[PDB]
Symmetry: C3
C-alpha cells in the first residue's frame, strides 16, 4: 500500500554522511530513522535527549498519520526507547522530525552520529465525529 | 476520514469546567483528553495514578479501535506518560475512559483538574482468522 | 474486518497446556498472548526478560502489520509492560513471536507459565514513497 509523502532535507549530511530512510524489504512495516548529531550523546540511565533527524515530512493526507516507535533490539536489549513512548506525527506537521530518546534501563548508552535510533510506521487514521448520547 | 462515534458524558463538569475533546485542525490525528478530577494529583517519580475523563465512547464498529498515547511534550519534557504505555479501546468497550498516568522521570508533577494529559487516535483494525500451518 | 493469517505452532504445549489466542468477542481489537515457559520467571523492578510464545505468524500481506502492546491491567496495576514499549511485527517476519517483558514499577512480579502477558493488534500499514522537495 504505497503513498507518496513529501520529504524535505534540513541538514546537508543527510543522504551523504548517512542515508535517507529506506524500507528493508517490500514487506517491512517500518522505516528506521537515524540520529543527525554533530557529536555522540551519552545517555545515562533515566536520561532523555532530543535527537534531530535532519528531515521533515509533510504527510498532507488527513486520513494518514505516522507513529514513531522504539527499535526492537535497542528497546529490549539496551533499554533505549522513546521518552514519549510513541510519537504521533499528524498530517499537517511540517517541522523537523525530532526523536525523544529515553534510557529506561540501567546501562549508559552512547548514541553515535548516524545511528538508527527509532522507527516510523504510516497508518490510516480516522477523525471521530462525536454523536452525543445520554445512554448507549 | 470521518466516522461517527457515540459519546456519553458521565460527569457534569465536562463541556463546562473544561471542554469536550476536539481536533485542533482537520489534519490532526489525535484528540487530547483532559483530567476529570475533583482535586489536583501530585505524582512523584515512579508513581502511577488512574485519571478519570468523565466520558465514555462506544465505537461499535468492529473494524475500528482507539489507541490512547502520551502527549508528546508531557512525555519528553516532563516524563508524564501512560502506565500501560498505549491504551487500546475496543469497539465494544462502553465504560468510562480512564487514563493510567505514570511519572517515568525524576521530577514530581501535579496533574491539574482539566489539564490535557493524554491523546487518543482512532485506527482501523483487523481481526486475524488463523490458518494453521506446519511450515510456512 | 477479517483477514486470514498463517500461524505455526512451535511448542507442543500450545493448544493443550494453554490455548491458542482467540478474540474475546467479535468487537475485540486485540488478541492476548501467553507466556510459553518451562518455569515461572520472577521479574524484579527494572528487570527485562524475553518470553517465548511458542507461536509464529506469517502475515504475508505487505499492507498489514501487527503491534504488540502491554495488557492494560498488567501495565497500570502491576507495572508489567514491554521492554521495547510497542513491538512491531512486519508482514515478512516468520520467526517465533517473542515478548520483551519489562517491570517498570516497584514490585517484583512472577510470570507464570501460560499467563497472558501481552496483546497483539493487526493494523493496516502504508509504505511511504518519498517525494523529495526543497520547500513545502
Ligand atoms: C544536529 C543538527 Hg543534525
Ligand atoms: C473525578 C470523578 Hg471526574
Ligand atoms: C519456552 C520455550 Hg516455550
Amino acid at each position: 500500500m504505497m503513498k507518496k509523502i513529501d520529504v524535505k532535507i534540513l541538514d546537508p549530511r543527510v543522504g551523504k554522511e548517512f542515508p535517507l530512510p529506506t524500507y528493508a524489504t517490500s514487506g517491512s512495516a517500518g522505516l528506521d530513522l537515524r540520529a543527525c548529531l554533530n557529536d555522540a550523546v551519552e545517555l545515562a540511565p533515566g536520561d532523555t535527549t532530543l535527537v534531530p533527524t535532519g528531515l521533515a515530512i509533510h504527510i498532507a493526507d488527513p486520513s494518514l498519520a505516522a507513529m514513531m516507535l522504539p527499535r526492537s533490539g535497542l528497546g529490549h536489549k539496551h533499554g533505549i526507547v522513546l521518552g514519549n513512548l510513541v510519537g504521533l506525527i499528524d498530517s499537517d506537521y511540517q517541522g523537523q522530525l525530532m526523536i525523544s530518546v529515553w534510557n529506561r534501563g540501567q546501562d549508559s548508552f552512547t548514541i553515535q552520529p548516524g545511528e538508527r535510533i527509532a522507527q516510523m510506521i504510516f497508518v490510516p487514521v480516522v477523525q471521530a465525529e462525536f454523536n452525543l448520547v445520554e445512554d448507549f
